[PDB]
Design an enzyme around this catalytic site. Structure first.
Site, PDB file in Angstrom:
ATOM      1  N   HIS A 169      -4.934  22.779   9.772  1.00 19.94           N
ATOM      2  CA  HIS A 169      -3.660  22.437  10.406  1.00 19.94           C
ATOM      3  C   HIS A 169      -2.523  22.515   9.400  1.00 19.94           C
ATOM      4  O   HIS A 169      -1.442  23.053   9.680  1.00 19.94           O
ATOM      5  CB  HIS A 169      -3.709  21.017  11.010  1.00 19.94           C
ATOM      6  CG  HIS A 169      -2.351  20.461  11.335  1.00 19.94           C
ATOM      7  ND1 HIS A 169      -1.570  20.944  12.365  1.00 19.94           N
ATOM      8  CD2 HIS A 169      -1.624  19.479  10.743  1.00 19.94           C
ATOM      9  CE1 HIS A 169      -0.428  20.276  12.401  1.00 19.94           C
ATOM     10  NE2 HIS A 169      -0.432  19.391  11.418  1.00 19.94           N
ATOM     11  N   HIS A 174       1.775  24.091   9.182  1.00 21.62           N
ATOM     12  CA  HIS A 174       2.970  23.603   8.501  1.00 21.62           C
ATOM     13  C   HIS A 174       3.538  24.544   7.468  1.00 21.62           C
ATOM     14  O   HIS A 174       4.755  24.736   7.378  1.00 21.62           O
ATOM     15  CB  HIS A 174       2.671  22.280   7.805  1.00 21.62           C
ATOM     16  CG  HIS A 174       2.637  21.121   8.735  1.00 21.62           C
ATOM     17  ND1 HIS A 174       3.786  20.571   9.272  1.00 21.62           N
ATOM     18  CD2 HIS A 174       1.602  20.402   9.227  1.00 21.62           C
ATOM     19  CE1 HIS A 174       3.453  19.561  10.056  1.00 21.62           C
ATOM     20  NE2 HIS A 174       2.135  19.446  10.057  1.00 21.62           N
ATOM     21  N   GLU A 214       6.127  18.925  14.603  1.00 22.50           N
ATOM     22  CA  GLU A 214       4.733  19.024  15.056  1.00 22.50           C
ATOM     23  C   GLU A 214       4.584  19.736  16.395  1.00 22.50           C
ATOM     24  O   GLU A 214       3.654  20.518  16.525  1.00 22.50           O
ATOM     25  CB  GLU A 214       4.043  17.639  15.128  1.00 22.50           C
ATOM     26  CG  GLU A 214       3.974  16.900  13.760  1.00 22.50           C
ATOM     27  CD  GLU A 214       2.933  17.433  12.733  1.00 22.50           C
ATOM     28  OE1 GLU A 214       2.099  18.289  13.074  1.00 22.50           O
ATOM     29  OE2 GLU A 214       2.942  16.965  11.557  1.00 22.50           O
ATOM     30  N   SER A 233      -1.618  25.279  15.149  1.00 23.61           N
ATOM     31  CA  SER A 233      -2.999  25.170  14.698  1.00 23.61           C
ATOM     32  C   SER A 233      -3.954  24.759  15.809  1.00 23.61           C
ATOM     33  O   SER A 233      -5.112  24.472  15.536  1.00 23.61           O
ATOM     34  CB  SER A 233      -3.132  24.174  13.534  1.00 23.61           C
ATOM     35  OG  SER A 233      -2.830  22.862  13.980  1.00 23.61           O
TER      36      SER A 233
HETATM   37  C1  UVF Z   1       5.433  10.702  11.398  1.00 24.75           C
HETATM   38  C2  UVF Z   1       4.024  10.426  11.951  1.00 24.75           C
HETATM   39  N1  UVF Z   1       3.060  10.259  10.841  1.00 24.75           N
HETATM   40  C3  UVF Z   1       2.927   9.071  10.269  1.00 24.75           C
HETATM   41  O1  UVF Z   1       3.585   8.131  10.691  1.00 24.75           O
HETATM   42  N2  UVF Z   1       2.040   8.894   9.231  1.00 24.75           N
HETATM   43  C4  UVF Z   1       1.286   9.967   8.794  1.00 24.75           C
HETATM   44  O2  UVF Z   1       0.502   9.779   7.860  1.00 24.75           O
HETATM   45  C5  UVF Z   1       1.462  11.167   9.388  1.00 24.75           C
HETATM   46  C6  UVF Z   1       2.334  11.294  10.403  1.00 24.75           C
HETATM   47  N3  UVF Z   1       2.315  12.551  10.842  1.00 24.75           N
HETATM   48  C7  UVF Z   1       1.414  13.192  10.110  1.00 24.75           C
HETATM   49  C8  UVF Z   1       1.094  14.679  10.260  1.00 24.75           C
HETATM   50  C9  UVF Z   1       0.288  15.028  11.519  1.00 24.75           C
HETATM   51  C10 UVF Z   1      -0.322  14.190  12.370  1.00 24.75           C
HETATM   52  N4  UVF Z   1      -0.904  14.979  13.298  1.00 24.75           N
HETATM   53  C11 UVF Z   1      -0.640  16.272  13.023  1.00 24.75           C
HETATM   54  N5  UVF Z   1       0.087  16.299  11.919  1.00 24.75           N
HETATM   55  C12 UVF Z   1      -1.117  17.355  13.830  1.00 24.75           C
HETATM   56  C13 UVF Z   1      -1.464  16.884  15.255  1.00 24.75           C
HETATM   57  C14 UVF Z   1      -2.445  15.722  15.111  1.00 24.75           C
HETATM   58  C15 UVF Z   1      -1.696  14.524  14.466  1.00 24.75           C
HETATM   59  N6  UVF Z   1       0.869  12.375   9.208  1.00 24.75           N
HETATM   60  C16 UVF Z   1      -0.170  12.753   8.215  1.00 24.75           C
HETATM   61  C17 UVF Z   1      -1.472  12.274   8.580  1.00 24.75           C
HETATM   62  C18 UVF Z   1      -2.532  12.412   7.689  1.00 24.75           C
HETATM   63  C19 UVF Z   1      -3.810  11.935   8.013  1.00 24.75           C
HETATM   64  C20 UVF Z   1      -4.021  11.315   9.247  1.00 24.75           C
HETATM   65  C21 UVF Z   1      -2.961  11.156  10.139  1.00 24.75           C
HETATM   66  C22 UVF Z   1      -1.696  11.638   9.808  1.00 24.75           C
HETATM   67 FE    FE Z   2       1.054  18.021  11.091  1.00 25.33          FE
END
Ligand code: UVF
Ligand code: FE
Length: 292
Positions: A169, A174, A214, A233
């Protein structure tokens, strides 16, 4: 009062480990939940990230044959769809990654190589992250043009398991858009707006981030195109998003921030940005109303 926020890129050392849900702590419905070998592998990746400090080269990983096959399956199917689905900026940058960072169906790119490429292109860099951070901590990285990036690979039993990010992903969703100057500026400004912001503001910024970075759509030459990394992705949702079956609304931060971010299903709605420049302008107007 104002909460602590990082003042320089090395300060992300103090919040990048504030992991709420560690990388090896699998969901009960995770395909690898009963796989001890996979659990041990995930602990290995989580520890690499926990031990990382700004300034370090990102540790290079020897991916297993099984992991590389998983990436190849995902890579081959998505690349069939990108020409007819992805935005022009995405399509412009993806071949540069093949040439310089070893994107191939039989090779998983290293985060250090991709980080070096991004630094040269837009000043973005990658930081490996053990697992989920608060939205405050995750968005704060973008202020310094740092993208917190998972390094592990999804379980091989389900090459289409999408609710948690993996490095597939990150790399396919990204990275190609972080290589684009207008998208990098847009992203950085989300991070800058979040720094020291109220909890209320951080949440709204996180939701705007979700429905652009996203799961965003944009309009180019009169066509709907995809720029959201979660769509780029996900084989099934990439197709869904540009089908007549999807509900679509204009990107409008005051409306978009009321929308629930769904996790285990397709989104209920997608938001269309006119361009990265216009999305950026709309966020500027919105942030003035929720922070200062
Ligand atoms: C602003 C929201 N948000 C947050 O608050 N905290 C995050 O850590 C975060 C996030 N967003 C993403 C990136 C992300 C989260 N996701 C995806 N990319 C693809 C679709 C599935 C969920 N991450 C990184 C992440 C890394 C490992 C597990 C969950 C999320
Ligand atoms: Fe993401």
């Amino acid at each position: 009062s104002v909460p602590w926020f990082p003042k320089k890129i090395s300060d992300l050392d103090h919040c990048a480990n504030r992991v709420l849900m560690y990388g090896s702590e699998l969901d009960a419905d995770h395909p690898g939940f009963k796989d001890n070998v996979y659990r041990k592998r995930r602990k290995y990746f989580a520890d690499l990230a926990m031990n990382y400090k700004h300034g370090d080269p990102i540790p290079k990983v020897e991916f297993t044959e099984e992991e590389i096959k998983t990436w190849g399956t995902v890579f081959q199917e998505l690349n069939k769809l990108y020409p007819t689905h992805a935005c022009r900026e995405y399509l412009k940058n993806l071949p540069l990654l093949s040439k310089y960072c070893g994107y191939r169906e039989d090779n998983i790119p290293q985060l250090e190589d991709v980080s070096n490429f991004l630094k040269e292109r837009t000043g973005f860099s990658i930081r490996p992250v053990a697992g989920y951070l608060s939205p405050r901590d995750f968005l704060s990285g973008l202020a310094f043009r740092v993208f917190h990036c998972t390094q592990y690979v999804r379980h091989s039993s389900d090459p289409f398991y999408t609710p948690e990010p993996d490095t597939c992903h990150e790399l396919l969703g990204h990275v190609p858009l972080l290589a684009e100057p207008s998208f990098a500026q847009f992203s950085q400004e989300i991070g800058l707006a979040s720094l020291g912001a109220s909890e209320e503001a951080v949440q709204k910024l996180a939701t705007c981030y979700f429905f652009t970075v996203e799961f965003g759509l944009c309009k180019q030459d009169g066509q709907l195109r995809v720029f959201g990394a979660g769509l780029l992705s996900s084989i099934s949702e990439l197709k869904h998003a540009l089908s007549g079956h999807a509900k679509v609304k204009p990107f409008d931060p005051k409306i978009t921030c009321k929308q629930e971010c769904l996790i285990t299903t397709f989104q209920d709605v997608y938001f269309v940005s006119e361009s990265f420049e216009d999305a950026k302008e709309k966020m500027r107007e919105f942030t003035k109303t929720i922070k200062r």
